[PDB]
Amino acid sequence: PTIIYTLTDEAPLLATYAFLPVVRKFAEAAGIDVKTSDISVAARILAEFGDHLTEEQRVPDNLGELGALTQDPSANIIKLPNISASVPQLLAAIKELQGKGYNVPDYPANPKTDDEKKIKDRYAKILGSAVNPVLREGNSDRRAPKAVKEYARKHPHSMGEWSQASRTHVATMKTGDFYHGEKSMTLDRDRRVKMVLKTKSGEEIVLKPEVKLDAGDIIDSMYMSKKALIAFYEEQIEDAYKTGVMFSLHVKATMMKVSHPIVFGHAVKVFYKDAFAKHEKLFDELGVNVNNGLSDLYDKIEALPASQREEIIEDLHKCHEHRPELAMVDSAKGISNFHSPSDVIVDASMPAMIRLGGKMYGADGRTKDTKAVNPESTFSRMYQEMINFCKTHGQFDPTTMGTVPNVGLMAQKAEEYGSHDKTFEIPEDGVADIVDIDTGEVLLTQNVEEGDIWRMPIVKDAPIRDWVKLAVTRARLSGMPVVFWLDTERPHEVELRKKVKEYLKDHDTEGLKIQIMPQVWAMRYTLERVVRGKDTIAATGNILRDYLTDLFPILELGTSAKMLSIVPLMAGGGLYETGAGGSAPKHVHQLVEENHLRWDSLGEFLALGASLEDMGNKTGNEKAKVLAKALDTATGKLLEENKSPSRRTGELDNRGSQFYLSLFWAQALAEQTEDAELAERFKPLAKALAEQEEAIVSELNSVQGKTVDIGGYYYPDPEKTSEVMRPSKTFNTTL
Amino acid sequence: PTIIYTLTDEAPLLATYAFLPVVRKFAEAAGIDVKTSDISVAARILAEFGDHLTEEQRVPDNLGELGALTQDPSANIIKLPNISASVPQLLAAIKELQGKGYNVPDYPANPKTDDEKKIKDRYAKILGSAVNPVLREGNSDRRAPKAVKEYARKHPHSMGEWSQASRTHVATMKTGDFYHGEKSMTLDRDRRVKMVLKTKSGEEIVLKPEVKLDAGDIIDSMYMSKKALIAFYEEQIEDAYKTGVMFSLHVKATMMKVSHPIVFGHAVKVFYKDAFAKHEKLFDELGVNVNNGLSDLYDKIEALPASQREEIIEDLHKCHEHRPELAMVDSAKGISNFHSPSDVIVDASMPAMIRLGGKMYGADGRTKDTKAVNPESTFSRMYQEMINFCKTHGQFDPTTMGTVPNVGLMAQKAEEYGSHDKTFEIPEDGVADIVDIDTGEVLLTQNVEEGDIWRMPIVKDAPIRDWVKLAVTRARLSGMPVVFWLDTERPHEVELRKKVKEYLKDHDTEGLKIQIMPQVWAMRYTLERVVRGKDTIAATGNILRDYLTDLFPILELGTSAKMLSIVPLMAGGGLYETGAGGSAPKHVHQLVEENHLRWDSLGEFLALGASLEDMGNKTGNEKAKVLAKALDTATGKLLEENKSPSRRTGELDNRGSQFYLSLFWAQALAEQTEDAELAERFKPLAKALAEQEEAIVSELNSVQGKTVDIGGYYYPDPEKTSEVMRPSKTFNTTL
Numbered sequence A, B: 001p002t003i004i005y006t007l008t009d010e011a012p013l014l015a016t017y018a019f020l021p022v023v024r025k026f027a028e029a030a031g032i033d034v035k036t037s038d039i040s041v042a043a044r045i046l047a048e049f050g051d052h053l054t055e056e057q058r059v060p061d062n063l064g065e066l067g068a069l070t071q072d073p074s075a076n077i078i079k080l081p082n083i084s085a086s087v088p089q090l091l092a093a094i095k096e097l098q099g100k101g102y103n104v105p106d107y108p109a110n111p112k113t114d115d116e117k118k119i120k121d122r123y124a125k126i127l128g129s130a131v132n133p134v135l136r137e138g139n140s141d142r143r144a145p146k147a148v149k150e151y152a153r154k155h156p157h158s159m160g161e162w163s164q165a166s167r168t169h170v171a172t173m174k175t176g177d178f179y180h181g182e183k184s185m186t187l188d189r190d191r192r193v194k195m196v197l198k199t200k201s202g203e204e205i206v207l208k209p210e211v212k213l214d215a216g217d218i219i220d221s222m223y224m225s226k227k228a229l230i231a232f233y234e235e236q237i238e239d240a241y242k243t244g245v246m247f248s249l250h251v252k253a254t255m256m257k258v259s260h261p262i263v264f265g266h267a268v269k270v271f272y273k274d275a276f277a278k279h280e281k282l283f284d285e286l287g288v289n290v291n292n293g294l295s296d297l298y299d300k301i302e303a304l305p306a307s308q309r310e311e312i313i314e315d316l317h318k319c320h321e322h323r324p325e326l327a328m329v330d331s332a333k334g335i336s337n338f339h340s341p342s343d344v345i346v347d348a349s350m351p352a353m354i355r356l357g358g359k360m361y362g363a364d365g366r367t368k369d370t371k372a373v374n375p376e377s378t379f380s381r382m383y384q385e386m387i388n389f390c391k392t393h394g395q396f397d398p399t400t401m402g403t404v405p406n407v408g409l410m411a412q413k414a415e416e417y418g419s420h421d422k423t424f425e426i427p428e429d430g431v432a433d434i435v436d437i438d439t440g441e442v443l444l445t446q447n448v449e450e451g452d453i454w455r456m457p458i459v460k461d462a463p464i465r466d467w468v469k470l471a472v473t474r475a476r477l478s479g480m481p482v483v484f485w486l487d488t489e490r491p492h493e494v495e496l497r498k499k500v501k502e503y504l505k506d507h508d509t510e511g512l513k514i515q516i517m518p519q520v521w522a523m524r525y526t527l528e529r530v531v532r533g534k535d536t537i538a539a540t541g542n543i544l545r546d547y548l549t550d551l552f553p554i555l556e557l558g559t560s561a562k563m564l565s566i567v568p569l570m571a572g573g574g575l576y577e578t579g580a581g582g583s584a585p586k587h588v589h590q591l592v593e594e595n596h597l598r599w600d601s602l603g604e605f606l607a608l609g610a611s612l613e614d615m616g617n618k619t620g621n622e623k624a625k626v627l628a629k630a631l632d633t634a635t636g637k638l639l640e641e642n643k644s645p646s647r648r649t650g651e652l653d654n655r656g657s658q659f660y661l662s663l664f665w666a667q668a669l670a671e672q673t674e675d676a677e678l679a680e681r682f683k684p685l686a687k688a689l690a691e692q693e694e695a696i697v698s699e700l701n702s703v704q705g706k707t708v709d710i711g712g713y714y715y716p717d718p719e720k721t722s723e724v725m726r727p728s729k730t731f732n733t734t735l
């Protein structure tokens, strides 16, 4: 009977320092041990580079440990939001660890000696989205809990009005992209395959030497034509200019770490083609990679002599005169859409733009309409339908609209999420085949060109079965109809359709509305329903799982940070994500400088409830059920009494809201009558907490408004942090 | 990017000489290379007997090459009607080749030495239905093209009227045949079995050493009783006589090379019982085998002294006075039903009889009502339902009736089509068991007699799956319902029924009308529907596929020569049979003697349209689909314009009709509007052919009416033959 709580980075971790003690006190009453696990960026640096560390300094491979635990039918993991480290974040975490006596190697951006290549490659394991692929050995059940939905209706968030005369739209490719050249197939038997490029010269380049494929795996051979991509950009940049609408670009270079920077990069290239021509030679040897955005260019020209660097920036701002207006990320500082690929992230930016009435920010500071460019059509057409719907129906009404929960196929690096190590920028014109080693059979041929992006996504049979099961499970349990978003004109989704059609019959689907529709149809059908106050489950692939679980919750609730993210693992256990957003760097900024943490721990409370409830069902622990339901009613009272953390310094913060939760949790257990022992167990505690309420609250608020010492950033001192995060001694002694 | 076009025998080959140049000129305009494959009777003898040939004389095994090519997903084979060599045909081919300096052995019918036995067996690989078993690695989709049916409505073919007092009927067995003694089962595991006869003496004769069987395969143990068959024969011959109705016998001796001649043989023997008893000893040692018809007896008595020969034939003619009139193949030359087993072929003779109003020819040369004897009741009683139907409803009206396409299970030597090498005339009374060699398990027991025909036909699981999938596909694409003609009382058809019941669930059958009925019922249901202009798909086994795709097309169209015969190959490719009939040797005799080939190449145009149709789907070729649709209208225009070959010499022939088709095809591409490049590409060629119409046709017609030289028959000279098949000056120069 063990719950694994994850120690992560920044704000969620700080909240954990105050919350971990109070969850431990409640969980022990059911015989559950709350065991910690450190997956912070620092702990992952240490675990990898234990080469020059003492025994006491060494840490286990906590990620690999948790990854292994997912195979255990009793796994119970609570995953808090964590950093997906960029280079600057990695460097800062390294530098802090070094200064604290941990002998870890520097990260060499450009490895001089060959020994530096090995440790740079070892750091590549730490960079980016590294935690999610390992923990996701199940499929996604993401939905807004009834109590949160009810709260959104009573307290509606602001939403920009949609004008019928709005000019904003999604711009996307009609040919030469992944979708319009896709070939797909379901595997007959186990095979081992290689990815080879037979050039026009006659040479055979092996891009990927070997990949093990199981029976029933779906594989795709999709590519994007570089020539088409640029001609598309030429066209759209021109169109946006001619029509006078603001140009914007929405990709996900954060997670799609290979393909999307190439997509991002090309936009910048063709947009500023006049400047990139004047300085081509200079840019080349400077090693400028604008795939990393303009920020890369600006870095590599900053060291240059003043008269030369100023000439460069002048050729860039001069290029704007024949160009369309650009969407800005920070219009005061002059930071635009093209500055960094990690600024405008498709899953978050598109909802934000729709939420605002189809608006993004201009160079003048004004909001205006935008051509929201999403080059890859596969998953972007669905956004356009909503824009169209809104244009005729107006902005959604949070007080009356329905819900769109999601059942997402993600398990075992599903589809595009596990295709990173299998994506390649093509070196020269040739034919790209995936060939079987045993029997030289080309499984899928594809004619590619120089620059083209080629990848082979993989989705295993077993995950698909669980995914369909979860769809029917959610349908039965909620009474909501469910729609599978599967295109008829996309090979990959016709392959999935064959499977869904079959595996549905393996389940009892007698009293359920379950159908299959292509993306755009499904979106329309879903929109036609939400607007009439009706609910619909979206059973979707991996990338759509990501998009829709940001999109709809932003519209329904105002945020994607207030919802359940349950991962039923295929081996029997459950993983429970508390948040889908970042670890809130700015929240830590406010905590260290003026002792106020505005992090909302609601997602943690909800996940813990879903953790404790599933503990009751799987093991038979009836005392877990009672704690879960009491936390369920404790969380609900937290919302209705309006005691979520304030953003203003000096008011009720994260620590303060943790008190009120634990109070209500204690009260809920004291005044219930389905377990006699637990009732009288919490009775004195509940009586205690309530009695010195405006004494504990008085302490937690008085200590605010000053600089505080946690002893670091990426590795804060457990002793100092705990003092700060538990500053109420009245509260602490009560347990 | 290739289409394999088969070079065959006789008339289709001659047509191909005129056609291959013009199909290549069109197919290169889409990036498709057309390569030939010689599978003629000559090429198949040379391929087998390369021992005595020089290196330059040696030809590749093209038939085996094509057999391997079916396993390739890119396969695209246009198969044309070839010769299924009879002995006299094989002899003539051997002589022709030997005469051309090809050292090939004589075929030894009665091998003296043991070295002669060797090469007779090597020739037995060439004899009979040799191509089809190897090429048919998929199931049959045989149907009338929409453009052909519509021509038959506007121009009906002559049909003989059905009197309600018509005496004609199918006579067939009620016990003792394969049907009423049949045992059948599905295999659970992989095993290897043997065919053994446990005799009365205690001895066990091994009839078949070893045969590998897969899991999920349907196997049958069927036997026809010698005593029951001759009792049947003696009853029906007596019946036909008593009633005064003309006797006729319908079998498939050509393909059923083992069982049917024994069946044919017993008919003749009991019919001529008086002669065969008087001359028993003489006929014994003369070696006369009536399994090969009366012609065999006529050969083996021709050399005998005039007095004795005239005694034998008078005893045969004397036997005719107490027997019924026999049906005549050619009454002028005195050739009857009994002359040769390969003269009256069931699948064509029965439709010919029914189309004629239930009439066949007699001694005087007039049409007469007949007793159409089909000894085996498994697939014959299906004919009797149509006869009855016609007796009450009169003849079919082709101007109003519906279509009956066929989806035929045939893949991988399925059912009775693969039973030849496993069919045995029983040597002595005993039990006939099929036994697993590993373990001693007796799978199917049966009790047989001296002279019985025992066989074990097999059909594999994967072919069945493709068959069912093809039915659903055809239903979905056309809209018309499909009926599985499967009996309840035939064990083989219940094993099939079980699989058809299961494998229909693995498919989307939503808006589709799919049902299983017994043969007799299904026929009646089909007939009741078509008579009021409604369409029905017949999903049937192997023999029924053959029978029905001659029967209805004969009635709907007047001929089974003009129709699509597509074979979706299981590996993903496609085979397109241009004709189910023969190679028409009489057409060749007319061409050599008078320079006029009356061969109809319409089946070749349709199979090419279908070949280009599938080409675009699998690979992605856009220009290929344009060619298919332009051909589909060019073929139609040819029918409408009435420019098909005449049969009278000195008029429009195969060469002429090929011109108009290429003219209509270029013109069809001259005015299309979806590939602007192809429109202007064929624009000069279409204008040239339309400008030279009366010049080209003047040439092709003036060369007729003369004896011409093609340098042989079974192996024609490519130079001389191309000189004959392309005699047009201005037509050729415009390519």
Ligand SMILES: [Mn+2]
Residues within 6 Å of the ligand: A347, A546, A547, A549, A550, A580
């Ligand atoms: Mn997201």
Ligand SMILES: [Mn+2]
Residues within 6 Å of the ligand: B347, B546, B547, B549, B550, B580
């Ligand atoms: Mn036939």
